RNA sequence: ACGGAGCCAGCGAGUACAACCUUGGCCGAGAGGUCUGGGUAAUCUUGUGAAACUCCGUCGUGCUGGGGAUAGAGCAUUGUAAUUAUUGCUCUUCAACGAGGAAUUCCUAGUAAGCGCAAGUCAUCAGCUUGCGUUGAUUACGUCCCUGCCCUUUGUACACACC
């Protein structure tokens, strides 16, 4: 039934991977705020972590929070396949990984400078900062700065 | 764009003991209470509003008359 | 053998054929009880013939209906026509024509399409647009 | 008196039969459950964490009971609605075939469905009796 | 025109793989039922073929 | 051969168009007027309506 | 870290069997090599092997002009000096270790980028 | 000696109707003349062929679209008849145009 | 909106001197693969079990689970050839967008609109077009006010004709 919900324990501010997460949102749809963590991946990591999907992110204790942040840092060990990974097969080492909030941003930037250093058509277009997937640019965007 | 919305939080999604008592007291004296009628009085966010509504349908505090999805009609019991 | 007749109703494409016999009051559309027509909205509409006649006026008459074509609610209106036409056909072939007159009077006093088929039908679409009587748009510049 | 599956509403019967399969420890659950969205067109995995597979299996059981026989591709075309193709107009996308194949294999293991001569899987005597039993149970639950 | 070079590109499929059987024009062909005629020589010879204005 | 009957009739129409266009192309000097095709159970007769019958026969 | 492509360093990639990299080399390369590719890359490969052999071990190999923009860099090509056909000039690409996987066309810009204003 | 029954079938196709009807009626009448049993000249749904073309040959102007169609009919007929009688019947009186096919269906 | 549960259509089209429609069964989460079967067609695809919609649940006003463009990483199929990303799938990133100025477009009943389906373009692709069906309305049922059209009368210094 309904719960009085642990008078004085409804936390509002959480710091997961230096992300200022709020608590009143649903757990999966609050963790989706963290970069590299989408709705689907957060939903799966919540299902594997045996915590209620309908349970809110404001009143969990720290043990579960740390258990999931462990789960979503080495996913493949926990019956998460190669897919569901932020950087599949990871073209640096061949070891499929799942980059996270700041790691995703840093590695995306590093890939951008790699594409510059290689001086590839895709990389040179990134240097310009234009359409790269080859679409028609007669009217695409027409305003970026 | 402009800071014209000025919309506050305006909702507490999960009840406390105080709001529990207010809900269980003001449950009668209202001929009609819905999900959004319950939201109107600022006492719940709204996702838990229907939770509280069905949880007031445990000892027949409020009788239901129509039980359609997204719209159930609840009238105080006497 | 048992007095039995066969009718049908239509809505835009939808065809509901009904076989009606002298039985013990069976209303089975697609081998299903009438209380269980899916839409959940126009359910009372299939009740419409029945409830204008009054179930007490037919209890040893049974009806089984096979239907196809059209949409859901078009299918429901085909059900309406099929049941009404079957009942009136049974009355006028076996009981009496005063009964047929009184049933037609009771029916036609409400939703005239109860016994008559909806005669107005979709028309072909044409070029120069995306509708049968619609044009794309004009620019001038 | 006599009762059949067609004589009870689809939704209440289907939920009740899914719960009935929930009670029995039968109907083996494949490994890749809890992970799959049952179709590419869907955006997020089923809200029902556990028991949704039993719901689909029950739906397969009733859906085979209605007609003569069906196949996994047929259910794939039926299962799954429209895919929000980003900006593109919503089309019809076939559901995941693996989930339906495993559902039908598990239903064969339960003996509620077997291989039909025409090609596909048709209802079984034991299976149709079980469906009649659960339909009677649901009908008596209603009244 | 070493035979291995000239005309070596395959035309199994695509626009240029089919001719009009009337003028050989690749543009605007009617491939339905293997008419293999373009739109307009077809509208010329269709009343002779058997197509007709009905609606 | 194994051809769809609808496609068989379409091919017959194309055949008729070819024959008529051909007979127009040559027999103008002999006054071509029309061509007819009768696919008989055994043979496939072709009739020529022409002005200069002496010339078309040769 | 010096450079790692897919876990194999430049030390092994420099002397690396091509097919053992075909087990690597994401889906498109695998499909290409599963269908087979053609004799023309074989000729190009032989020409570059000869050119690399004949280079005097301290100067970069001679420029080999090449029209095949549909080509992917094989591991056994690093350091080659190939002019890919931009249309007018076989604009130069010297085969860096990261060339592998990417196509030749990814470095020959067929259009000169536009300048407005 | 082919007196035994063969369950023969006659398929028909015609871009027109009048000659097809005449052929079917003639076949039925000949069968009655030799007094054979049959399934009636069951009609087949009008196989209508429609293809649309841009009526302009170049592509300018108000968008005009034209539709060219045929309508073919099959009308298959099965005969529980012996061999040579039905062969003689189906090899006589075939007016031009109407394509006829014969199958033993053995 | 998203999850589940129901489960209704029609026009089409479809392999031969070449390789289509694809059933059904094994696989893979998927796209997709494989084994076999029918169908030259009211037979088989297919009753194209189509969406929109119907019921029950989660979300509850916050650029929010709306919105999915823009970016990376992989896996697939077509193609001799996918790089300037062919296309589909997996994951993540999440833009602008608060029902939009002057103006302007289409429409009177199965009609507008919403929703799809099939066919044409086809190796592979649609945001397109052509046909089809589905949920199926508001508002007239009239007038020259605007834009024109028709017939008559009248005037003109116009006739390559009020540009
Ligand atoms: Mg241009
Ligand atoms: Mg429309
Ligand atoms: Mg559907
Ligand atoms: Mg669905
Ligand atoms: Mg829905
Ligand atoms: Mg939408
Ligand atoms: Mg969404
Ligand atoms: Mg149909
Ligand atoms: Mg957002
Ligand atoms: Mg829409
Ligand atoms: Mg076009
Ligand atoms: Mg003058
Ligand atoms: Mg002037």
PDB file of N, CA and C in Angstrom, chain B residues 2-70:
ATOM      1  N   UNK B   2      12.684  34.057 -22.535  1.00  0.00           N
ATOM      2  CA  UNK B   2      12.643  34.979 -21.412  1.00  0.00           C
ATOM      3  C   UNK B   2      12.204  34.258 -20.140  1.00  0.00           C
ATOM      4  N   UNK B   3      12.602  34.821 -18.999  1.00  0.00           N
ATOM      5  CA  UNK B   3      12.254  34.266 -17.691  1.00  0.00           C
ATOM      6  C   UNK B   3      10.843  34.704 -17.284  1.00  0.00           C
ATOM      7  N   UNK B   4       9.881  34.366 -18.144  1.00  0.00           N
ATOM      8  CA  UNK B   4       8.487  34.728 -17.928  1.00  0.00           C
ATOM      9  C   UNK B   4       7.655  33.603 -17.330  1.00  0.00           C
ATOM     10  N   UNK B   5       8.123  32.356 -17.406  1.00  0.00           N
ATOM     11  CA  UNK B   5       7.364  31.245 -16.841  1.00  0.00           C
ATOM     12  C   UNK B   5       7.237  31.382 -15.329  1.00  0.00           C
ATOM     13  N   UNK B   6       8.368  31.559 -14.640  1.00  0.00           N
ATOM     14  CA  UNK B   6       8.398  31.765 -13.188  1.00  0.00           C
ATOM     15  C   UNK B   6       7.648  30.664 -12.441  1.00  0.00           C
ATOM     16  N   UNK B   7       7.670  29.448 -12.981  1.00  0.00           N
ATOM     17  CA  UNK B   7       6.941  28.335 -12.387  1.00  0.00           C
ATOM     18  C   UNK B   7       7.784  27.692 -11.293  1.00  0.00           C
ATOM     19  N   UNK B   8       7.236  27.631 -10.081  1.00  0.00           N
ATOM     20  CA  UNK B   8       7.919  27.004  -8.962  1.00  0.00           C
ATOM     21  C   UNK B   8       7.800  25.485  -9.058  1.00  0.00           C
ATOM     22  N   UNK B   9       8.328  24.790  -8.045  1.00  0.00           N
ATOM     23  CA  UNK B   9       8.212  23.335  -8.008  1.00  0.00           C
ATOM     24  C   UNK B   9       6.752  22.908  -7.943  1.00  0.00           C
ATOM     25  N   UNK B  10       5.974  23.550  -7.071  1.00  0.00           N
ATOM     26  CA  UNK B  10       4.519  23.472  -6.995  1.00  0.00           C
ATOM     27  C   UNK B  10       3.991  22.096  -6.604  1.00  0.00           C
ATOM     28  N   UNK B  11       4.851  21.111  -6.352  1.00  0.00           N
ATOM     29  CA  UNK B  11       4.366  19.771  -6.061  1.00  0.00           C
ATOM     30  C   UNK B  11       5.351  19.029  -5.172  1.00  0.00           C
ATOM     31  N   UNK B  12       4.802  18.239  -4.253  1.00  0.00           N
ATOM     32  CA  UNK B  12       5.548  17.236  -3.508  1.00  0.00           C
ATOM     33  C   UNK B  12       5.036  15.865  -3.925  1.00  0.00           C
ATOM     34  N   UNK B  13       5.891  15.090  -4.591  1.00  0.00           N
ATOM     35  CA  UNK B  13       5.420  13.871  -5.239  1.00  0.00           C
ATOM     36  C   UNK B  13       5.084  12.781  -4.225  1.00  0.00           C
ATOM     37  N   UNK B  14       5.813  12.704  -3.115  1.00  0.00           N
ATOM     38  CA  UNK B  14       5.644  11.639  -2.134  1.00  0.00           C
ATOM     39  C   UNK B  14       5.159  12.255  -0.831  1.00  0.00           C
ATOM     40  N   UNK B  15       4.092  11.686  -0.279  1.00  0.00           N
ATOM     41  CA  UNK B  15       3.439  12.250   0.892  1.00  0.00           C
ATOM     42  C   UNK B  15       4.302  12.109   2.139  1.00  0.00           C
ATOM     43  N   UNK B  16       4.082  13.019   3.083  1.00  0.00           N
ATOM     44  CA  UNK B  16       4.587  12.912   4.440  1.00  0.00           C
ATOM     45  C   UNK B  16       3.425  12.531   5.358  1.00  0.00           C
ATOM     46  N   UNK B  17       3.702  12.442   6.660  1.00  0.00           N
ATOM     47  CA  UNK B  17       2.633  12.149   7.611  1.00  0.00           C
ATOM     48  C   UNK B  17       1.599  13.268   7.638  1.00  0.00           C
ATOM     49  N   UNK B  18       2.057  14.519   7.572  1.00  0.00           N
ATOM     50  CA  UNK B  18       1.136  15.650   7.580  1.00  0.00           C
ATOM     51  C   UNK B  18       0.190  15.581   6.388  1.00  0.00           C
ATOM     52  N   UNK B  19       0.747  15.444   5.181  1.00  0.00           N
ATOM     53  CA  UNK B  19      -0.095  15.354   3.996  1.00  0.00           C
ATOM     54  C   UNK B  19      -0.926  14.079   3.997  1.00  0.00           C
ATOM     55  N   UNK B  20      -0.419  13.006   4.607  1.00  0.00           N
ATOM     56  CA  UNK B  20      -1.233  11.810   4.797  1.00  0.00           C
ATOM     57  C   UNK B  20      -2.501  12.150   5.571  1.00  0.00           C
ATOM     58  N   UNK B  21      -2.347  12.881   6.677  1.00  0.00           N
ATOM     59  CA  UNK B  21      -3.499  13.246   7.492  1.00  0.00           C
ATOM     60  C   UNK B  21      -4.431  14.187   6.734  1.00  0.00           C
ATOM     61  N   UNK B  22      -3.874  15.145   5.988  1.00  0.00           N
ATOM     62  CA  UNK B  22      -4.731  16.052   5.224  1.00  0.00           C
ATOM     63  C   UNK B  22      -5.525  15.301   4.161  1.00  0.00           C
ATOM     64  N   UNK B  23      -4.895  14.344   3.477  1.00  0.00           N
ATOM     65  CA  UNK B  23      -5.614  13.557   2.478  1.00  0.00           C
ATOM     66  C   UNK B  23      -6.724  12.749   3.139  1.00  0.00           C
ATOM     67  N   UNK B  24      -6.406  12.060   4.239  1.00  0.00           N
ATOM     68  CA  UNK B  24      -7.417  11.229   4.881  1.00  0.00           C
ATOM     69  C   UNK B  24      -8.499  12.044   5.580  1.00  0.00           C
ATOM     70  N   UNK B  25      -8.262  13.332   5.834  1.00  0.00           N
ATOM     71  CA  UNK B  25      -9.296  14.165   6.436  1.00  0.00           C
ATOM     72  C   UNK B  25     -10.173  14.818   5.374  1.00  0.00           C
ATOM     73  N   UNK B  26      -9.558  15.459   4.384  1.00  0.00           N
ATOM     74  CA  UNK B  26     -10.289  16.066   3.281  1.00  0.00           C
ATOM     75  C   UNK B  26     -10.752  15.057   2.239  1.00  0.00           C
ATOM     76  N   UNK B  27     -10.571  13.757   2.475  1.00  0.00           N
ATOM     77  CA  UNK B  27     -11.126  12.769   1.551  1.00  0.00           C
ATOM     78  C   UNK B  27     -12.645  12.865   1.457  1.00  0.00           C
ATOM     79  N   UNK B  28     -13.400  12.982   2.549  1.00  0.00           N
ATOM     80  CA  UNK B  28     -14.812  13.356   2.434  1.00  0.00           C
ATOM     81  C   UNK B  28     -14.934  14.856   2.184  1.00  0.00           C
ATOM     82  N   UNK B  29     -16.183  15.329   2.171  1.00  0.00           N
ATOM     83  CA  UNK B  29     -16.544  16.733   1.969  1.00  0.00           C
ATOM     84  C   UNK B  29     -16.223  17.194   0.551  1.00  0.00           C
ATOM     85  N   UNK B  30     -15.625  16.320  -0.252  1.00  0.00           N
ATOM     86  CA  UNK B  30     -15.438  16.545  -1.679  1.00  0.00           C
ATOM     87  C   UNK B  30     -16.334  15.575  -2.434  1.00  0.00           C
ATOM     88  N   UNK B  31     -17.342  16.113  -3.121  1.00  0.00           N
ATOM     89  CA  UNK B  31     -18.250  15.263  -3.882  1.00  0.00           C
ATOM     90  C   UNK B  31     -17.519  14.549  -5.010  1.00  0.00           C
ATOM     91  N   UNK B  32     -16.493  15.183  -5.571  1.00  0.00           N
ATOM     92  CA  UNK B  32     -15.717  14.599  -6.655  1.00  0.00           C
ATOM     93  C   UNK B  32     -14.231  14.807  -6.416  1.00  0.00           C
ATOM     94  N   UNK B  33     -13.458  13.734  -6.570  1.00  0.00           N
ATOM     95  CA  UNK B  33     -11.999  13.797  -6.581  1.00  0.00           C
ATOM     96  C   UNK B  33     -11.499  12.920  -7.720  1.00  0.00           C
ATOM     97  N   UNK B  34     -10.641  13.477  -8.564  1.00  0.00           N
ATOM     98  CA  UNK B  34     -10.011  12.760  -9.664  1.00  0.00           C
ATOM     99  C   UNK B  34      -8.500  12.770  -9.461  1.00  0.00           C
ATOM    100  N   UNK B  35      -7.774  12.277 -10.464  1.00  0.00           N
ATOM    101  CA  UNK B  35      -6.319  12.383 -10.431  1.00  0.00           C
ATOM    102  C   UNK B  35      -5.900  13.848 -10.463  1.00  0.00           C
ATOM    103  N   UNK B  36      -6.427  14.608 -11.425  1.00  0.00           N
ATOM    104  CA  UNK B  36      -6.030  16.003 -11.548  1.00  0.00           C
ATOM    105  C   UNK B  36      -6.783  16.900 -10.576  1.00  0.00           C
ATOM    106  N   UNK B  37      -7.980  16.502 -10.145  1.00  0.00           N
ATOM    107  CA  UNK B  37      -8.628  17.221  -9.051  1.00  0.00           C
ATOM    108  C   UNK B  37      -7.775  17.120  -7.792  1.00  0.00           C
ATOM    109  N   UNK B  38      -7.209  15.937  -7.540  1.00  0.00           N
ATOM    110  CA  UNK B  38      -6.277  15.776  -6.430  1.00  0.00           C
ATOM    111  C   UNK B  38      -5.006  16.588  -6.652  1.00  0.00           C
ATOM    112  N   UNK B  39      -4.520  16.641  -7.896  1.00  0.00           N
ATOM    113  CA  UNK B  39      -3.348  17.461  -8.207  1.00  0.00           C
ATOM    114  C   UNK B  39      -3.623  18.937  -7.942  1.00  0.00           C
ATOM    115  N   UNK B  40      -4.863  19.378  -8.165  1.00  0.00           N
ATOM    116  CA  UNK B  40      -5.197  20.795  -8.058  1.00  0.00           C
ATOM    117  C   UNK B  40      -4.893  21.340  -6.667  1.00  0.00           C
ATOM    118  N   UNK B  41      -5.157  20.555  -5.629  1.00  0.00           N
ATOM    119  CA  UNK B  41      -4.939  21.031  -4.265  1.00  0.00           C
ATOM    120  C   UNK B  41      -3.465  21.020  -3.844  1.00  0.00           C
ATOM    121  N   UNK B  42      -2.520  20.831  -4.765  1.00  0.00           N
ATOM    122  CA  UNK B  42      -1.085  20.981  -4.536  1.00  0.00           C
ATOM    123  C   UNK B  42      -0.506  19.934  -3.591  1.00  0.00           C
ATOM    124  N   UNK B  43      -1.312  18.990  -3.107  1.00  0.00           N
ATOM    125  CA  UNK B  43      -0.818  18.070  -2.091  1.00  0.00           C
ATOM    126  C   UNK B  43      -0.040  16.889  -2.659  1.00  0.00           C
ATOM    127  N   UNK B  44      -0.125  16.625  -3.961  1.00  0.00           N
ATOM    128  CA  UNK B  44       0.620  15.529  -4.567  1.00  0.00           C
ATOM    129  C   UNK B  44       1.098  15.930  -5.954  1.00  0.00           C
ATOM    130  N   UNK B  45       2.185  15.289  -6.386  1.00  0.00           N
ATOM    131  CA  UNK B  45       2.713  15.558  -7.714  1.00  0.00           C
ATOM    132  C   UNK B  45       1.757  15.144  -8.816  1.00  0.00           C
ATOM    133  N   UNK B  46       1.194  13.944  -8.703  1.00  0.00           N
ATOM    134  CA  UNK B  46       0.212  13.481  -9.664  1.00  0.00           C
ATOM    135  C   UNK B  46       0.379  12.042 -10.106  1.00  0.00           C
ATOM    136  N   UNK B  47       1.624  11.579 -10.221  1.00  0.00           N
ATOM    137  CA  UNK B  47       1.842  10.157 -10.469  1.00  0.00           C
ATOM    138  C   UNK B  47       1.467   9.335  -9.247  1.00  0.00           C
ATOM    139  N   UNK B  48       1.820   9.822  -8.059  1.00  0.00           N
ATOM    140  CA  UNK B  48       1.370   9.217  -6.817  1.00  0.00           C
ATOM    141  C   UNK B  48      -0.033   9.665  -6.429  1.00  0.00           C
ATOM    142  N   UNK B  49      -0.621  10.609  -7.168  1.00  0.00           N
ATOM    143  CA  UNK B  49      -1.991  11.021  -6.879  1.00  0.00           C
ATOM    144  C   UNK B  49      -2.963   9.870  -7.089  1.00  0.00           C
ATOM    145  N   UNK B  50      -2.861   9.181  -8.228  1.00  0.00           N
ATOM    146  CA  UNK B  50      -3.713   8.019  -8.446  1.00  0.00           C
ATOM    147  C   UNK B  50      -3.371   6.880  -7.497  1.00  0.00           C
ATOM    148  N   UNK B  51      -2.110   6.780  -7.074  1.00  0.00           N
ATOM    149  CA  UNK B  51      -1.736   5.799  -6.060  1.00  0.00           C
ATOM    150  C   UNK B  51      -2.508   6.062  -4.774  1.00  0.00           C
ATOM    151  N   UNK B  52      -2.516   7.320  -4.333  1.00  0.00           N
ATOM    152  CA  UNK B  52      -3.290   7.693  -3.156  1.00  0.00           C
ATOM    153  C   UNK B  52      -4.781   7.482  -3.379  1.00  0.00           C
ATOM    154  N   UNK B  53      -5.273   7.740  -4.592  1.00  0.00           N
ATOM    155  CA  UNK B  53      -6.693   7.538  -4.865  1.00  0.00           C
ATOM    156  C   UNK B  53      -7.083   6.073  -4.713  1.00  0.00           C
ATOM    157  N   UNK B  54      -6.325   5.164  -5.329  1.00  0.00           N
ATOM    158  CA  UNK B  54      -6.659   3.749  -5.193  1.00  0.00           C
ATOM    159  C   UNK B  54      -6.411   3.267  -3.770  1.00  0.00           C
ATOM    160  N   UNK B  55      -5.509   3.933  -3.044  1.00  0.00           N
ATOM    161  CA  UNK B  55      -5.254   3.544  -1.664  1.00  0.00           C
ATOM    162  C   UNK B  55      -6.308   4.086  -0.707  1.00  0.00           C
ATOM    163  N   UNK B  56      -7.068   5.104  -1.113  1.00  0.00           N
ATOM    164  CA  UNK B  56      -8.293   5.453  -0.405  1.00  0.00           C
ATOM    165  C   UNK B  56      -9.442   4.518  -0.756  1.00  0.00           C
ATOM    166  N   UNK B  57      -9.308   3.734  -1.824  1.00  0.00           N
ATOM    167  CA  UNK B  57     -10.243   2.650  -2.102  1.00  0.00           C
ATOM    168  C   UNK B  57      -9.674   1.347  -1.540  1.00  0.00           C
ATOM    169  N   UNK B  58      -9.630   1.306  -0.216  1.00  0.00           N
ATOM    170  CA  UNK B  58      -9.267   0.116   0.539  1.00  0.00           C
ATOM    171  C   UNK B  58     -10.318  -0.268   1.566  1.00  0.00           C
ATOM    172  N   UNK B  59     -10.926   0.713   2.234  1.00  0.00           N
ATOM    173  CA  UNK B  59     -12.032   0.482   3.156  1.00  0.00           C
ATOM    174  C   UNK B  59     -13.280   1.239   2.714  1.00  0.00           C
ATOM    175  N   UNK B  60     -13.356   1.571   1.429  1.00  0.00           N
ATOM    176  CA  UNK B  60     -14.518   2.264   0.894  1.00  0.00           C
ATOM    177  C   UNK B  60     -14.703   3.675   1.406  1.00  0.00           C
ATOM    178  N   UNK B  61     -13.610   4.427   1.549  1.00  0.00           N
ATOM    179  CA  UNK B  61     -13.730   5.846   1.877  1.00  0.00           C
ATOM    180  C   UNK B  61     -14.387   6.602   0.732  1.00  0.00           C
ATOM    181  N   UNK B  62     -14.001   6.295  -0.504  1.00  0.00           N
ATOM    182  CA  UNK B  62     -14.553   6.935  -1.693  1.00  0.00           C
ATOM    183  C   UNK B  62     -15.026   5.844  -2.643  1.00  0.00           C
ATOM    184  N   UNK B  63     -16.294   5.905  -3.043  1.00  0.00           N
ATOM    185  CA  UNK B  63     -16.832   4.886  -3.936  1.00  0.00           C
ATOM    186  C   UNK B  63     -16.482   5.216  -5.385  1.00  0.00           C
ATOM    187  N   UNK B  64     -16.067   4.231  -6.181  1.00  0.00           N
ATOM    188  CA  UNK B  64     -15.876   4.450  -7.617  1.00  0.00           C
ATOM    189  C   UNK B  64     -17.148   4.129  -8.383  1.00  0.00           C
ATOM    190  N   UNK B  65     -17.372   4.861  -9.476  1.00  0.00           N
ATOM    191  CA  UNK B  65     -18.522   4.623 -10.336  1.00  0.00           C
ATOM    192  C   UNK B  65     -18.112   4.266 -11.760  1.00  0.00           C
ATOM    193  N   UNK B  66     -17.035   4.863 -12.269  1.00  0.00           N
ATOM    194  CA  UNK B  66     -16.483   4.501 -13.568  1.00  0.00           C
ATOM    195  C   UNK B  66     -14.998   4.228 -13.401  1.00  0.00           C
ATOM    196  N   UNK B  67     -14.520   3.142 -14.007  1.00  0.00           N
ATOM    197  CA  UNK B  67     -13.145   2.712 -13.792  1.00  0.00           C
ATOM    198  C   UNK B  67     -12.356   2.653 -15.094  1.00  0.00           C
ATOM    199  N   UNK B  68     -12.543   3.638 -15.967  1.00  0.00           N
ATOM    200  CA  UNK B  68     -11.816   3.674 -17.227  1.00  0.00           C
ATOM    201  C   UNK B  68     -10.381   4.142 -16.999  1.00  0.00           C
ATOM    202  N   UNK B  69      -9.490   3.708 -17.886  1.00  0.00           N
ATOM    203  CA  UNK B  69      -8.098   4.122 -17.812  1.00  0.00           C
ATOM    204  C   UNK B  69      -7.968   5.623 -18.048  1.00  0.00           C
ATOM    205  N   UNK B  70      -7.045   6.239 -17.303  1.00  0.00           N
ATOM    206  CA  UNK B  70      -6.715   7.660 -17.396  1.00  0.00           C
ATOM    207  C   UNK B  70      -7.842   8.553 -16.888  1.00  0.00           C
TER     208      UNK B  70
END
